[PDB]
């Protein structure tokens, strides 16, 4: 049909950063957005977080501001995986609270 | 001049509201800049036919082609006739692919059923040889199409053929030059040119030729797949814009066109919301030129922003600026296109109202922006729109409602004098009960909110449920009660396509046979083949007539493939009194599913006449006004309080409350089965059940439904 859905949208992006030609893409994006603020993060999913770190994780000259609240992650039924958050919680050591 | 970001998505509305009060209020308008595609039937229609070789041919889809005048006319199909075809297609079992090859081409199991060739065959096979006589070629004829009406079958059967000729003609790739006639041929094959359409059609042929000639010009060797051309024909058609009425019959509603900044006295901008106006689209990314800009360069961002400026510049007398402030759902707030923000911000920063001359920059500013900004209402009939001052609406139409000058709907039930005749076909008493309220609507004032267009199964039958399975249980039952051959039925049922596929169908049948047999056996076990009887009773000054079927010397024996219901007991109860009155002393049973039963003892011809009256009484009052009595809800509450011992009608607050449960439980059923209340007839009387009319329902339904329980078994 030549059509595209949303699950696909952020899925195809995850494959691209996975494939061999995943670096020219990682760097490309990385330049355009040297510092990114991810909001309502407590609701991400493996597909998301993957794309995210595959671009900004451990990268000088860039900043990844992950903000949200694990106590409010209630969208399990749509795929918000609280676990992938706790995973991300483990990888980044800089923690802050309001 | 009124300009909007997307003139296509504003057109419905523009037309809508400019459709107002002929005299006074009216002012002509002309929309320009719409797209050819998004504004012409046939266009998207043809583009559709260009997709045949990929289509699954789902039922609703093909029939959809018929709603296109020109296409229907081309096959001598009328709005009159469509209504039949539409029914037959559904009832004949059509829902899938055109051919069998069509199915295999989809790497699917050719079942040889439910496809069009099947449905059509069943129809033409019906044209002749009737439904009975058996299955022809594993196919069972469909008789609804037998009379002169069978002529329509020819027209439909003629279309699908054309569609198939082409669905297969357009299949393979051809050298550019060969595709040239294709567009013209098709249009003549599916469209009987109107007048308007003659125009639109010529446009199709233009682009088609264009797209092809162009490819030939650049000398393209290899062949071309249809998709290529269709997808392009689509795009072009999507960009071809119609705007011939731009400056004749006044008031121009359009979009912001670059390089067309004409001066107007009045300039209105609508939908200037953030994310909507400065129209976007990101450069290819591999458009070198966009990374290393130069003085000559151009981009939409720049074009649009300089457009907004050309407006302000071109507005000679009045500049009208409007945007949407909130979505009429989550009610969250939206924002004005930054451009509009940059305007009032400048206004406020360089102006001050007469009053406020000595207060503050920020403070004087606010009052200015706030003064020019006008927050409108959600509904047009909101009274604020009708007080005095800033834009009092010019639409008196709404005024009355704005002034709460309405007169609340008056209670629907108004007793209607009724003259009790003499001689009421037994049928009118049978059809009165088994739902009386309905009877007052359909009988007393010929009101039948008829409902038929009934959903066509978007698929073949994998499962049997509801109305269908019942209908199938009716024949299977009867066939087992007549100790006939169930094998015959089966084959017939299958040849019509009413059963799931093979192994699964064989299974379905087999298990229904098992439940129906259990039932039939209960009938056979005491079925004394009797015959018809005539009704001609004399009751409290009234007559009646009817044909009580299979009346046995035992009395009455009825059976049905459904669950027990109070409504059904009443049916047999009436069929009984009449029977007992007409003389004949005997009994009467109604065998249902799950071993249910409604059995009544022989009555003395005298008392039979005594109750045949009360039923006759209800029909009378029922004809004056809606006689309540909800056989199920009432039957429930009525069954929870009754007792076989001493004919004990309970009054204790223990069950008087369990009953009230059983009642509401029946009135408003589960999430699965669903309540007696859920019913148009009752719906028109009241949308919500009031504890008041509930009483009326009990008291009343107890007054007529009690004898049913005082005598069962």
């Amino acid at each position: 049909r030549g059509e595209l859905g949303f699950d696909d949208m952020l899925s195809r992006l995850d494959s691209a950063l996975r494939s061999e030609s995943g670096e020219v893409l990682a760097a490309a994006i990385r330049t355009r957005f040297p510092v990114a603020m991810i909001d309502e993060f407590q609701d991400t999913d493996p597909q998301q977080y993957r794309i995210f770190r595959r671009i900004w994780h451990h990268q000088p000259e860039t900043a990844l501001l992950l903000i949200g609240d694990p106590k409010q992650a209630i969208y399990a039924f749509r795929g918000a995986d609280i676990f992938t958050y706790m995973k991300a919680r483990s990888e980044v050591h800089a923690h802050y609270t309001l | 001049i009124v300009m909007v970001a997307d003139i296509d998505s504003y057109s419905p509305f523009i037309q809508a509201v400019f459709g107002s009060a002929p005299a006074d209020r009216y002012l002509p308008y002309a929309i320009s800049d719409r797209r050819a595609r998004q504004s012409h039937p046939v266009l998207e229609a043809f583009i559709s036919l260009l997709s045949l070789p990929d289509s699954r041919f789902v039922s609703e889809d093909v029939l959809a082609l018929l709603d296109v005048p020109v296409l229907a006319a081309r096959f001598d199909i009328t709005e009159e006739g469509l209504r039949y075809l539409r029914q037959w297609v559904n009832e004949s079992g059509i829902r899938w692919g055109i051919d069998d090859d069509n199915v295999r081409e989809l790497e699917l199991p050719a079942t040889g059923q439910h496809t069009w060739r099947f449905g059509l065959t069943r129809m033409l096979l019906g044209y002749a040889m009737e439904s009975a006589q058996g299955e022809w070629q594993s196919v069972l004829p469909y008789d609804e199409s037998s009379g002169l009406i069978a002529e329509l079958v020819g027209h439909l059967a003629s279309l699908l053929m054309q569609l198939n000729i082409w669905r297969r003609g357009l299949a393979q790739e051809r050298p550019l030059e060969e595709w040239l006639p294709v567009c013209r041929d098709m249009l003549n094959a599916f469209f009987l040119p109107d007048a308007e359409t003659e125009a639109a059609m010529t446009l199709i042929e233009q682009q088609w030729q264009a797209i092809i000639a162009e490819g030939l010009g650049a000398q393209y060797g290899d062949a071309v797949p249809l998709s290529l051309l269709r997808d392009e024909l689509a795009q072009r058609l999507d960009q071809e814009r119609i705007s011939q009425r731009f400056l004749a019959g006044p008031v121009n509603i359009c979009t912001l066109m670059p390089m067309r900044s004409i001066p107007f006295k009045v300039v209105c901008l609508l939908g200037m919301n953030d994310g909507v106006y400065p129209r976007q689209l990101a450069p290819l990314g591999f458009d070198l030129m966009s990374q290393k800009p130069k003085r000559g360069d151009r981009s939409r961002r720049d074009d649009d922003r300089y457009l907004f400026l050309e407006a302000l510049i071109s507005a000679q007398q009045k500049l009208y600026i409007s945007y949407i402030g909130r979505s009429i759902q989550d009610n969250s707030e939206r924002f004005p296109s930054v451009l509009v923000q940059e305007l009032i911000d400048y206004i406020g920063q360089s102006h001050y109202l007469p009053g406020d001359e000595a207060l503050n920059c920020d403070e004087s500013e606010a009052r200015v922006k706030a003064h020019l900004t006008c927050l409108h209402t959600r509904m047009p009939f909101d009274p604020q729109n009708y007080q005095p001052g800033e834009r009092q609406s010019y639409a008196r139409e709404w005024l009355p409602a704005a002034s709460q000058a309405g007169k609340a709907h008056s209670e629907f039930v108004q007793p209607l004098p009724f003259t009790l005749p003499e001689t009421v076909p037994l049928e009118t008493l049978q059809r009165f009960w088994a739902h009386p309220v309905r009877a007052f609507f359909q009988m007393r004032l010929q009101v039948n909110f008829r409902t038929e267009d009934s959903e066509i199964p978007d698929t073949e039958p994998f499962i049997l449920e509801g109305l269908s399975r019942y209908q199938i249980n009716q024949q299977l039952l009867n066939a087992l009660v007549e100790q006939d051959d169930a094998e015959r039925l089966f084959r017939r049922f299958r040849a019509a396509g009413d059963l799931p596929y093979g192994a699964f169908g064989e299974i379905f049948w087999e298990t229904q046979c098992q439940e129906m047999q259990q039932l039939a056996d209960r009938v056979i076990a005491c079925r004394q083949p009797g015959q018809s009887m005539e009704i001609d009773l004399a009751c409290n000054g009234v007559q009646i007539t009817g044909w009580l079927p299979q009346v046995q010397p035992d009395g009455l024996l009825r059976w049905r493939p459904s669950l027990l219901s109070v409504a059904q007991g009443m049916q047999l109860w009436l069929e009984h009194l009449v029977y007992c009155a007409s003389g004949g002393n005997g009994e009467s049973r109604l065998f249902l599913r799950k071993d249910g039963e409604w059995r009544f003892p022989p009555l003395a011809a005298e008392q039979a006449l005594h109750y045949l009256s009360q039923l006759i009484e209800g029909y009378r009052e029922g004809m004056s006004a809606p006689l309540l009595v909800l056989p199920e809800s009432g039957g429930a509450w009525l069954k929870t309080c009754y007792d076989a011992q001493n004919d004990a009608m309970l009054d204790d607050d223990s069950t008087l409350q369990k009953a009230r449960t059983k009642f509401l439980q029946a009135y408003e059923g589960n999430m699965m089965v669903r309540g007696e209340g859920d019913d148009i007839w009752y719906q028109r009387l009241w949308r919500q059940l009031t504890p008041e009319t509930m009483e009326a329902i009990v008291e009343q339904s107890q007054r007529f439904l009690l004898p049913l329980f005082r005598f069962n078994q």
């Binding site: 030549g2 059509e3 595209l4 | 699917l108 199991p109 698929t459 499962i463 192994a503 699964f504 299974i507």
Partner: protein, 49 residues
């Protein structure tokens, strides 16, 4: 030039049923029945996956 799909909720049922046709139709009774006792139709198979 991608077109934003909307269906899916349907595209999905259709797919789940194409699966039921090419996979269950060709089945021989002994097997077919087993399947039947696991799920009655494609509709039931979807409500599970």
């Amino acid at each position: 030039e991608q077109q934003l799909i909307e269906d899916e909720s349907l595209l999905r049922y259709q797919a789940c049923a194409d699966f039921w046709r090419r996979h269950c139709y060709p089945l021989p009774r002994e097997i077919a029945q087993v399947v039947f006792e696991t799920w009655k139709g494609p509709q039931a198979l979807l409500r599970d996956i």
